[PDB]
Design a protein around this ligand. Structure first.
Ligand SMILES: [Mg+2]
Ligand SMILES: [Mg+2]
Ligand SMILES: [Mg+2]
Ligand SMILES: [Mg+2]
Lengths: 425, 425
RNA sequence: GGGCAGGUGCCCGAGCGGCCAAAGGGGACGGUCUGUAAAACCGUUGGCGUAUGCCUUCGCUGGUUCGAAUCCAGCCCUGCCCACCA
RNA sequence: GGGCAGGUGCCCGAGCGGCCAAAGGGGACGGUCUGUAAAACCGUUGGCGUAUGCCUUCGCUGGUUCGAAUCCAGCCCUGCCCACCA
């Protein structure tokens, strides 16, 4: 139901760069399903909303009739860094992690075969001969390859670059040859390797792939890209209660990009939400995405129609807190209840064996560590000095307190981490 | 008949560097035939006295009971430079060139199997998998590999380095792993790649090879290394007449190195020859080597005993021109006859068809080109202006001369190139 | 994927419309003197049988011009510089 | 194959025998004020149930010393610099 020009315009929204854009228009006019490549690193199988930026653009390709080929990078996943300057995965860890990745990616991507194929690049890379590897690497010079920013910066700074790292752009580029990619997806940070793909496809007599680059989502800290290692992320499989709370804590300046990169709202609708204020805009964002990722798969369009289909009223601009799917309504209620200093209805339970007692009690610092709220008794003590711990809703001021557990106690660390502890022989 | 220490001392003579030298002593004390590697590039199968420096050291290893493994580099010979920034050999040109190389190398190397094996590195390189190649290249960093002088100089100068060129040191190093090399031979200009061999052998759990580096022989120009492309070389298969003349024209300052790198004369004997004067020293050098390379194989020791076995007297210091093998005596006589302005007894004949005539004659410039002495009539004319051409022993002063060929004529270009021309329908 | 600059004779490299088979350095080649060496000095370093000429010639293919190695356009390869940078 | 220098806390990085769980910048974490936001301000940023203490702590393994993150030795990895350069 879209002309090629309409399809290009839909696809352009949110993108940092489509290159060459005119080539994508030509491919869209061929009236055939385009092969849309995404390489996935099996060593990092847990997806977050940052990964969803590219994956939802791929879903849009699929809704337009194009075919995702998801390439698990098990070849390099099983080699890793053989020098040491992440460890290598076993064949079992590789299929396990691939399974996790595909399961989470399927919360976004269509899975019908005509729209989706899973491949493992070991299928074709394991057999690539030395001679073919030499001829592949001859396609670029040393100076050309050192232009990539992490090579240039490390080299000029005296930080080691393993020479095998110069082979990996060619493996990724060969993956494009192996599947005859029409488009390769990536974040902006993959631009160089995607361009190498074009060069390698030309050398193999193929049409060079369009490189389709999405911006990187910034994390909850407000400065750095969302990433697992920076602990600033929102995972696609986090419980609705936690996803909703994290989305309410997205720094205000990031709201436009979250709406543009994670929903399909029109720019006029986004502006209308921001005019209602930052907290209203947050509630709408959190409801949309918490709902979408609570489903087994996000809808084809996370848009105003989807919002109203959940039971919310657009013209209420966040005030209609009692509507929505039960999972979302409850999550939002918990957020507000915790905000005004209340204790939520359901909190995690940790049963503590009687063997942990000492003179019939448990030192409060060690109790928090046993409950999993603190990593050490020393840290529990420091948090008490900083008024960061509560017991039964009272701020702890005595770091020597010995806690009576003859009835369950409610422990709290910071703003919203609660554990109810009770004794059990 | 040599202790390990005696063997090391023999081997050290002429060498620029044995590294680690103490490791070679340890290997010699094992009392077993050591595997002595030489890689040979099949694209350059014609050998000259420069190649003889390394090859004669290998012969000395063989005379001490050690085993040469001669590795034809047909893998890289058949790939070449796939970018273009020498062309690739066909499988037929590769075996043909290998045949030429081995034939000439056998003028120096023993050929018994226990002392000599021929291998082609395609035997093991063609099958090296991509995974193994990645792990090989991980053994060095970019900065380490760019230390090699031609990489550092080209990179700093903005001269292209094809990235596949960074793979070739690993292929050469893997060849050492494949044959379990104890020693790898090379000129000083191969020091870096030989050291990479050590590093790769260690990674494969092998004893790292001793790197055995010979200096490079300087050519007849007196400055540059002897090499085919600089036209300053003496080929191992040149006719005795020409080898003898070229050896008489070795610049005086190179005499010590030619004696050290190409003969086994003692330093005392070499000094005694130089004391007799440069021309006497030249005659002895030219007789020794012309004789040695006129044989189907050089003797185990090109030394004073070998000299006297040819019929010459050491104490004559070159004056005994009438002695020696017929081939040498005749070559030396030709040299002296040409020197004093005579025409040699036997000169090449070129028969010229009558169709080349013009008004019953041939313009002298075109005659020299037809005889193969000049590459163009223009050059023949320039040489006449420079008094570089003779006809029947007279210096040509008329560049318009039309030559009568009703009897054979003797043409001369420069000092010692002669062609007798005669007509033939 | 974007920009700029470069590719010239045996090599490096200059060339800013004619003075260009082309500066300068190097190399090689011929000769003198000899030792078939070096040095020093002089010469040579696209081709063509009638020359006041013809052919070809500066990465490739075209173009403006009486005339292009030079200026213009498209292309090839390279270098630097962008892009990428969390 | 040879030389020198480097590797420190969440990160960068200082440390020149004790003043070192360790400068400075950054990050993160707790709290106030709130909007479970930012800002600003104050605090925190090896472990240990009795603490004036104990354990562990600056690439690895040892050593000098009352005492080593610091000095010494051997080793690992890296960077620069050699070697290689025709
Ligand atoms: Mg570019
Ligand atoms: Mg470009
Ligand atoms: Mg080194
Ligand atoms: Mg070293």
């Amino acid at each position: 139901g879209h002309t090629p020009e309409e399809a290009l315009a839909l696809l352009k929204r949110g993108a940092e760069e489509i290159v060459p854009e005119e080539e994508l228009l030509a491919k869209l006019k061929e009236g055939r399903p385009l092969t849309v490549k995404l390489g996935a690193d099996p060593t990092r199988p847990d997806l977050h909303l940052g990964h969803a930026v590219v994956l939802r653009k791929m879903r849009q390709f699929q809704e337009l009739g194009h075919k995702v080929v998801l390439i698990i990078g098990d070849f390099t996943g099983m080699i890793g860094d053989p020098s040491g300057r992440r460890p290598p995965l076993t064949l079992e860890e590789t299929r396990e992690n691939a399974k996790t990745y595909v399961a989470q990616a399927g919360k976004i991507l269509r899975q019908e075969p005509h729209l989706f194929e899973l491949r493992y690049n070991s299928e074709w890379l394991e057999g690539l001969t030395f001679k073919e590897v030499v001829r592949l690497t001859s396609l670029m010079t040393v100076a050309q390859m050192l232009e990539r920013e992490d090579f240039k910066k490390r080299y000029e700074a005296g930080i080691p670059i393993s020479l095998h790292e110069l082979l990996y752009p060619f493996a990724q580029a060969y993956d494009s040859v192996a599947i005859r990619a029409d488009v390769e997806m990536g974040g902006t940070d993959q631009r160089f390797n995607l361009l190498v793909g074009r060069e390698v496809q030309r050398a193999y007599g193929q049409s060079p792939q369009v490189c389709f680059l999405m911006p990187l989502l910034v994390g909850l800290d407000g400065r750095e890209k969302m990433s697992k290692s920076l602990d600033n992320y929102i995972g696609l499989t986090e419980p609705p209660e936690a996803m909703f709370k994290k989305l309410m804590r997205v720094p205000d300046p990031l709201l436009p990009s979250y709406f543009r990169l994670l929903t399909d709202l029109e720019e006029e609708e986004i502006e209308a939400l921001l005019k209602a204020g930052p907290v209203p805009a947050h509630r709408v964002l959190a409801r949309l995405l918490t709902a979408a990722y609570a489903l087994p798969q996000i809808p084809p369009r996370i848009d105003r129609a989807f919002y109203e289909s959940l039971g919310y009223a657009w013209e209420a601009f966040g005030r209609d807190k009692e509507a929505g799917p039960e999972e979302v309504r409850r999550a939002e209620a918990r957020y507000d209840e915790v905000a005004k200093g209340g204790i939520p209805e359901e909190i995690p339970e940790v049963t503590i064996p009687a063997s942990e007692l000492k003179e019939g009690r448990i030192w409060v610092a060690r109790l928090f560590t046993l409950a999993g709220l603190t990593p050490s008794n020393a840290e529990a003590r420091r948090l008490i000095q900083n008024r960061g711990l509560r017991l039964d809703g009272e701020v702890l001021t005595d770091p020597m307190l010995q806690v009576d557990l003859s009835r369950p106690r409610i422990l709290q660390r910071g703003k919203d981490r609660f554990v109810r502890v009770r004794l059990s022989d």
